[PDB]
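User: Predict the full complex structure for these chains.
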Amino acid sequence: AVIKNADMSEEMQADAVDCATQALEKYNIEKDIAAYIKKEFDRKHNPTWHCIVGRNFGSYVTHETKHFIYFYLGQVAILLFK
Amino acid sequence: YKIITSYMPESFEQDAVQIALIAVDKYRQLKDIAFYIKHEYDKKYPGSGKATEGVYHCIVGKSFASAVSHETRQFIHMKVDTYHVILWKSK
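Assistant: Here is the predicted structure of the two-chain assembly.
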């Protein structure tokens, strides 16, 4: 997995950047991949998050408290916030 | 100019559609139209600085995807001018 920029809970971010392999191997489509990744992240970290995975989409909106990163994995990216 | 999904108030949805049409007619890139939408849609929504927490979402691009339990009846994700654009309240 890779990244573009980061201002986040880097412990939770770098934990998720290697925990998302479970959903990537688990699911089989970008919608289902993002679903199975975010469900695992919500069960693990906390009951408040927001992730948009995939590519070919842009975003410039205000972030949450302590999470903001564009962390990718082989040009199938993730936009992560709390 | 076309919409694909919206759970929201009809007048608020039409206002967002008009603002999005104006922005898409004006702005160019993904970040540029994302920023114009995110800024200009915060006017006609009265921002309540009370205990409720809400925000704007910006997705103006070719093809990504998501499926979440967002804010109840507060999310409009359209697909217009060969650019899907999702905007939802922060849960």
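Chain B has one domain: 1-91.
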